[PDB]
Paper text:
To test this hypothesis, we performed a rigorous 3D classification focused on the C tier of the MCM ring of all replisome particles. This analysis identified six conformational states of the replisome, referred to as States I-VI, which vary in both Polε stability (Conformers I-IV) and the location of leading-strand DNA lining the MCM pore. State II (4.23 Å), which accounts for 22.5% of the total particles, is almost identical to State I, except that the leading-strand DNA is released from [name]. In Conformer I (equivalent to States I and II) with a stable Polε, the MCM ring adopts a compact inter-CTD interface of [name]:5. In particular, a stable attachment of the leading-strand DNA to the CTD interface of [name]:5 is crucial for modulating the MCM ring into a conformation competent for Polε to dock.
Residue numbers in the entry:
A (entry chain 5): 20 to 106, 130 to 200, 205 to 213, 234 to 305, 319 to 517
B (entry chain 6): 257 to 419, 434 to 463, 499 to 509
C (entry chain 3): 163 to 324
D (entry chain 2): 180 to 710, 738 to 868
The structure:
Amino acid sequence: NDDDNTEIIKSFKNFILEFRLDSQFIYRDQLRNNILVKNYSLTVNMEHLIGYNEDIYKKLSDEPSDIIPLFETAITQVAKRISILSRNSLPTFQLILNSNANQIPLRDLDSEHVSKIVRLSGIIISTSVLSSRATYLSIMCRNCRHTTSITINNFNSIVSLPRSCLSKNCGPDPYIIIHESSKFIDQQFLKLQEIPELVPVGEMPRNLTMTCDRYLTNKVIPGTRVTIVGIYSIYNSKNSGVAIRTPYIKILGIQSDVETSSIWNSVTMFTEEEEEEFLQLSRNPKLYEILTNSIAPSIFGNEDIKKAIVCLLMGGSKKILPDGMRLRGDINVLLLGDPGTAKSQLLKFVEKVSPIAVYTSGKGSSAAGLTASVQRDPMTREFYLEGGAMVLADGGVVCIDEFDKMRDEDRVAIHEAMEQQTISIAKAGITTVLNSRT
Amino acid sequence: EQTERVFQISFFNLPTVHRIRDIRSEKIGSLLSISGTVTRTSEVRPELYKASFTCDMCRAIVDNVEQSFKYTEPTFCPNPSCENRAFWTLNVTRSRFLDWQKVRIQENANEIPTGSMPRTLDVILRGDSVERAKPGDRCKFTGVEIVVPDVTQLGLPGVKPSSNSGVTGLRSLGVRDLTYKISFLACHVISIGRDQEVFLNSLS
Amino acid sequence: AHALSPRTLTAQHLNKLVSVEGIVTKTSLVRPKLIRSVHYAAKTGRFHYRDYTDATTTLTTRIPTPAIYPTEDTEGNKLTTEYGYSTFIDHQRITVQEMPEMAPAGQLPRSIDVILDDDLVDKTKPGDRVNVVGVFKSLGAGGMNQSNSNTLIGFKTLILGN
Amino acid sequence: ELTLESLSNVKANSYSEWITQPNVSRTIARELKSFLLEYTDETGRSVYGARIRTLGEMNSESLEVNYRHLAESKAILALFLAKCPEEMLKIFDLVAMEATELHYPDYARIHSEIHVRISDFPTIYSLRELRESNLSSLVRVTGVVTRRTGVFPQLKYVKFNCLKCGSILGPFFQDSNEEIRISFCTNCKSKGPFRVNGEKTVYRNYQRVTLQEAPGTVPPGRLPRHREVILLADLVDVSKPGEEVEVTGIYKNNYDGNLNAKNGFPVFATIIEANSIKRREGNTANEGEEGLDVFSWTEEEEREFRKISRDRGIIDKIISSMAPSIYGHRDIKTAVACSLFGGVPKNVNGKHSIRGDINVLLLGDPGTAKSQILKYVEKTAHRAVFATGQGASAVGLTASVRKDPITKEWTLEGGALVLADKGVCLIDEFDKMNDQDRTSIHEAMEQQSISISKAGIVTTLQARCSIIAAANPNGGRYNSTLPLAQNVSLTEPILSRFDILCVVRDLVDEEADERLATFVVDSHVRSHPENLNARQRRLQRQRKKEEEISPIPQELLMKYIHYARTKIYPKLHQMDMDKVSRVYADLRRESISTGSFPITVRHLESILRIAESFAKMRLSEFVSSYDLDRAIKVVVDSFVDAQKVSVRRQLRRSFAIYTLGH
DNA sequence: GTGTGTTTTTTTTTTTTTTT
DNA sequence: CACAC
Ligand SMILES: Nc1ncnc2c1ncn2[C@@H]1O[C@H](COP(=O)(O)OP(=O)(O)OP(O)(O)=S)[C@@H](O)[C@H]1O
Ligand SMILES: Nc1ncnc2c1ncn2[C@@H]1O[C@H](COP(=O)(O)OP(=O)(O)O)[C@@H](O)[C@H]1O
Ligand SMILES: [Mg+2]
Ligand SMILES: [Mg+2]
Ligand SMILES: [Zn+2]
Ligand SMILES: [Zn+2]
Ligand SMILES: [Zn+2]
């Protein structure tokens, strides 16, 4: 197996060092630039690898869970070769993949596709906190004090401490983790929901758990529509049939459209070309009219309403005085009138166009479900807060249809947050004041 | 397709009818005619009656294995070439099963002394006597007053003993104690609370 | 760069001394724990001490002690546990979460567990803003014990407050 | 060399052991091959050859073989199947795979194996009447889906690797009922830990559904029983939660320590391995039909639909066949047909979405067969959900969240409108439920979506429902001299969604009374229970009684409706926007001036929706001029009949210039 | 001597839902 | 984890 591993590693190293379209070694340059900014990762495009050699792509697609670590090792070797003068302590790089394969529907994932490469889409609904998985693990033998090290691929096959002393018997479990010398990486658990337009008729949407890793952690937030290219993997949870196995995805690529966590991490992820295009658009004298005409084109008339929608989507400038109190920069707009005047269509369009937007129905709305819900943790028996609908719209807009159908006890709960942009919760021993600038 | 016909003897019209208050453990292994109001009934499940096992090697078939309240299996292979003391595969097709239900009865309303909580009991029904006593119907059961030990203490391949006088000291028990629970096993029950030609033929 | 928040406390800072600001929200009850037991042998008139170490007590990893008082000497002599001369330390476990106001849009505040010991117990109460300086240590087995071979649970991470 | 008669006289004591005989297995394989290739019905075509054709073409991997077909020809095979299905499932699946190879060479690439779904099992049971004699045998129990786990991959061929000495274990077949046991290792007799090999292992889909005794069949005042059914690969996700279905499968049993501990007896727990499924939710009045899918249409059925579609006057014949047992009321029949076929839901660039379902409200005096019309619609449409008056709350209509009793978290379950998605929802006594419940359906009937923002669960469901409602005029009688709004208790927005509103008046006319009473009495005499074997003779009698009243057979009309709904997407290219614009402008002009009926843009879209339904019912893929004029006439007549009689004559005089030609 | 088995929990507190 | 089965 070592000979085959070396063969594959050398082939991938040659692919990295040699691949180029026109006089520019794209992957070499990308790896160098990523190393320059201490970004130990590499985004490998699938068509490039396929065009380089179909055999490598076939071997990858057959058993990705075993091929990928060899590719990462080759990437690390290339990084050492072309970023450090020979004659270390460089972390193993994280591979990122981009593909154009047909996106398999979420409910179409079945008993087959196991341990394969799968591309699909969905909407994020839950993002757990970052846990830590060990990669370098310094370990100590309990009795004879034989210290060694272990390297963990983090790619579960379908690993535990060695069951022998390995140099008096020292017991079947003679090993203890040396925490102060081991190395760990961050891991995040996400929960995807299938696209509502792709659900079966009369069928509730299907959830699916997956795991990010390292540089892919904290890449998206719940409520965002993304596409994932990963591995359809299996793990056995001990929590009700016989020989049942929990399915999940190991992520190898994210393609979002609303940027990273926060609003592009509350800073500009804007490339120079699109930024310059925005500046050019800003200099248009008729920009106001163009924006007004670009709001709900299917909706005839309602020019003043469209202009007010433009103002809302832009919003004022938040002011924070030295004395402590703040001045909000959001606009609150209500649309009353006769039924059948495309007001709901206007709200749907606003939810569609706004980068952050949550559309809610008047009747299907509770005060505890709009801002925050106090829920008891099933495992730890502890209460915690889960963000409500309007909280998910933080920094954006909430389009509440059937506003006349607010429950009087539910409508009042938004009075503080739509003005103070803050939500005060004093429930189940929890006393917090979160921000909701919606 | 020979099918060994097992029989269920149904006794009825005993000289005496006891009640839950009249229950005495000294009548164990005897026939009574308990009458009580049915409140809760279990489902119709198949219970092993005559086990038919097969030893894992040399394939010797052990049949007609008597079953106690536990999951008892044969402990020795009749063929003196098979090392088998706890390893068997039950021949599900060959083994015999009985339709089984656990009904819950309680004291009749008229038999309740003032203030006293009406007293309950659990009865086992088998064969045609299954589903003939729906909840709410006061029925005059009859059968044998038996006692069920706690099979968790007896030791089971799938469960473990779980935690006011219990007896202990058995070879199969070891250190744990054994507790007992009175139950009834009925052989007969009676509740005490369409074409023209078909009607003519069913009419005296 | 070691001045961080519970949200920004990435795994790369493990075994590195960091300072984290936050709000005290939950405080476990003050619970003393043994670090050194003293025993008297009423057949030789000698005092034998046995020092107890834990992953949450000492920074350097050592073999955990079964927390059993040795009632007998090596030379078959009965030992009586000498309370008062044995050594116990006050221990507490509080939860520190970031500011709600620097919490990013669309996200709830995240929290970390801090282990105050000896003097630092009861020095804070829930609802207090605080800045703690201490070691970002990691604990647990993370499966890796044939109990969870493919299961993807991580490791216990916490801060030993200094 | 064994004959079918040689199959009949068993030699081995047990039937399963008899089947295990190799010569018997080969004989049964060849006989099933012949039965598949040569079974011919009355019309003469070999059903199963075309079934293999379709199985290959759609790669269904499942061969639905009727129990009645195997019982009628080579009966002892069906007797064995009803007695010992366990091995012949494998054998007949292999024979089906070989036949597919015959029709489709090298079909093993697409599907390594084939399954068979036995349909029309005679012995129907319930979760109360099951007995131990039914073990290891096929059943046809009926129940409502209560719980349903996710689609878990499950081990098919476990190939363990020994840890002490060996490295490979045999590909044991997982029973999916009890965990695979290895016992002493084959490589060495010593016992130790074991785990599967990730190199050569295959998985099959696994779902754990729980059927419960249906409320209809449970005796009143008694608790309903429940039993569990396992859906294997290609059978998972076939029945929604809360669905009433009929399952044909094997009634197996297995041992668990927990049950013995709880009951103190060596009792096993039963379990059902699914083999075929027919959803019976919404068609509880459609007995006597064959096949697991009543709305399923054959190729000849589609050919007949195409042939009768080209007929002129098909619209009128269809309209007359909506209520064959209900005399008169042709406009209501037309509106019901339009709502049944429905329009095409437009979605402009993914930004603007247009409802393509027609919602109809019937206001009328009691005893006008409005409830009977709704019952016919429920029995008729593909997906039908019936709710009545106060017997349906706000959350039960659309959706509701609940704390999971087992896992302790909030989960969302769909309501009446979710189960009626892309179907029809019928609301009896639409005037009689709570207004707060009545307002919970605005998003459902206009945006065709359900948005829930409660208990930390925020989502937007889709409910492409076609709302049909029945109400009662104020005081129980309709005062024609008053505006419609004064004769109702509802508001404009609830009135606005309904594309068509039909007003029914109970008058006393001797000719009308004569004809209606005669029709009702003729139907009742026809409906009397007392009014070449028994089956087809009964079918011939039913067809004789149906042809008196139904121009088109209802069992074929329902298939035609399903086919048109699922395969016709008419387009409005051939039309004149001038007439429609003028009609809408005049409608609004007369509504604002001496009128109470709200005429909004939704109402203008209703005309195109009804025209689309008209094109659908002719299987036309383009809305013809007749389909537009008929829709315009229907809309203007429904508007006029909603006005008071004082101005009704003048409104009809104004509108007469638009319904030209009819 | 190889391998086990515990200790081990469903309260009070939110949120929803139907009646009342 | 470790003492008791
Ligand atoms: N000015 C307009 N231009 C285009 N379409 C319109 C216009 N006014 C109304 N409509 C249409 O009329 C329908 C209105 O439906 P909705 O927007 O859901 O209801 P609404 O107008 O918000 O009023 P409600 O919700 O009943 S109070 C949609 O099909 C719109 O496309
Ligand atoms: N036009 C009609 N043709 C035939 N039967 C009718 C007609 N109108 C009413 N009926 C009969 O009246 C009975 C009761 O009607 P019902 O459904 O109560 O009307 P509504 O829903 O208006 O109260 C039904 O059994 C039906 O057969
Ligand atoms: Mg609207
Ligand atoms: Mg009626
Ligand atoms: Zn050692
Ligand atoms: Zn044997
Ligand atoms: Zn072995």
